Amino acid sequence: KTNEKFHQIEKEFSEVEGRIQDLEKYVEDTKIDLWSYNAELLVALENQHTIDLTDSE
Amino acid sequence: PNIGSRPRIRDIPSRISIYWTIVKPGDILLINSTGNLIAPRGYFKIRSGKSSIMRSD
Amino acid sequence: YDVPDYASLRSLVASSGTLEFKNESFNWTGVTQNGTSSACIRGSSSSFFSRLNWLTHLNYTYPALNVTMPNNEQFDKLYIWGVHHPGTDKDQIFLYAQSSGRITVSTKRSQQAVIPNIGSRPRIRDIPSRISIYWTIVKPGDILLINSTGNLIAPRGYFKIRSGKSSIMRSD
């Protein structure tokens, strides 16, 4: 059930450019951190609910 | 255009700078110049799409 | 001084956390060095910035410059320089023989061309003139080429730009 992500911003750099490049790196890092926390929380919730479901059953 | 003695790469010091202008339907494109012009031979069909670019090996 | 794109130069400098300035023997010939300003006082005497070298006419002339400095070793080299925006036409002629001197600092990858514009800015600390601070970073294997016809404030060396964990903050 993935979603299309055809076009995105450039996420790798080989030069120092200034404030816009730093902003792009910052938004990339914030998105990655938020999605990592979301994934960890989702896995923990699903594991807890599965372990409790297969015990209440 | 600004004349300048840039370091030689492939035994040529001169450079070119590439611009781009997009014309909407109903508009016209007008080109005026007095020198240092590198003109187009035609136009590219810019359109919305699902294409993308990536850098790999 | 006023720095075009100041918020980017500040972040670029603050991310390295190193002020290891290394003097380099540049090829400034035919012009006088060590310009002196009265608003800058060091040791109760007129002075100027230590890192930036303010060049001026020598013997009522200012020959065009073409200097180079290759980067051999395996680290980047950051050059901080600037351009002097004078107050009036008289203040421009008194310092340089050229009234509208272009400047051009080029690496192999890209070039920067600047035109100083004369203007009567409001006086701050009893001086109307300004300076604009730029910066060029040289990758390993590239060379830095500086060409100028006036209004040049050259570097004395280079800063050792490197990746690091440093940062900047504003507090009291």
Ligand SMILES: *[C@@H]1O[C@H](CO)[C@@H](O[C@@H]2O[C@H](CO)[C@@H](O[C@@H]3O[C@H](CO)[C@@H](O)[C@H](O)[C@@H]3O)[C@H](O)[C@H]2NC(C)=O)[C@H](O)[C@H]1NC(C)=O
């Ligand atoms: C301004 O300074 C630059 C940098 O020093 C000079 O560019 C360099 O000029 C030399 C001498 O012409 C070049 O080396 C030789 O060039 C010719 C090419 O026709 C040829 O004899 C050799 O193959 C050799 O390459 C050199 O490539 C060139 N570039 C660099 C990066 O060093 C420049 O000539 C100076 N003067 C002016 C008026 O631009």
Ligand SMILES: *[C@@H]1O[C@H](CO)[C@@H](O[C@@H]2O[C@H](CO)[C@@H](O[C@@H]3O[C@H](CO)[C@@H](O)[C@H](O)[C@@H]3O)[C@H](O)[C@H]2NC(C)=O)[C@H](O)[C@H]1NC(C)=O
């Ligand atoms: C253009 O207009 C500006 C703004 O009015 C003028 O700048 C101001 O000029 C006055 C008169 O020179 C300055 O006041 C006095 O200046 C001298 C400095 O040598 C001195 O007698 C006093 O200490 C006093 O400061 C004033 O500072 C200056 N700036 C401002 C912000 O008011 C300017 O002179 C006009 N003309 C030209 C040709 O630029």
Ligand SMILES: *[C@@H]1O[C@H](CO)[C@@H](O[C@@H]2O[C@H](CO)[C@@H](O)[C@H](O)[C@H]2NC(C)=O)[C@H](O)[C@H]1NC(C)=O
């Ligand atoms: C640096 O580039 C400048 C132009 O930016 C060159 O200056 C020219 O030099 C020639 C040769 O003396 C003069 O006839 C021209 O009038 C100059 N033009 C300008 C706009 O100043 C200069 O040649 C370059 N430096 C060197 C050392 O070659």
Ligand SMILES: *[C@@H]1O[C@H](CO)[C@@H](O)[C@H](O)[C@H]1NC(C)=O
């Ligand atoms: C320095 O600049 C002068 C300019 O005339 C040039 O002739 C000379 O070769 C350069 N290098 C040295 C080491 O003097």
Ligand SMILES: *[C@@H]1O[C@H](CO)[C@@H](O)[C@H](O)[C@H]1NC(C)=O
């Ligand atoms: C300019 O001042 C510096 C620093 O004091 C000194 O090393 C240099 O020799 C001076 N150059 C000239 C041309 O006076």
Ligand SMILES: *[C@@H]1O[C@H](CO)[C@@H](O)[C@H](O)[C@H]1NC(C)=O
């Ligand atoms: C300055 O240039 C003039 C005109 O060529 C010459 O007579 C004089 O000797 C020069 N002075 C110096 C200090 O080079």
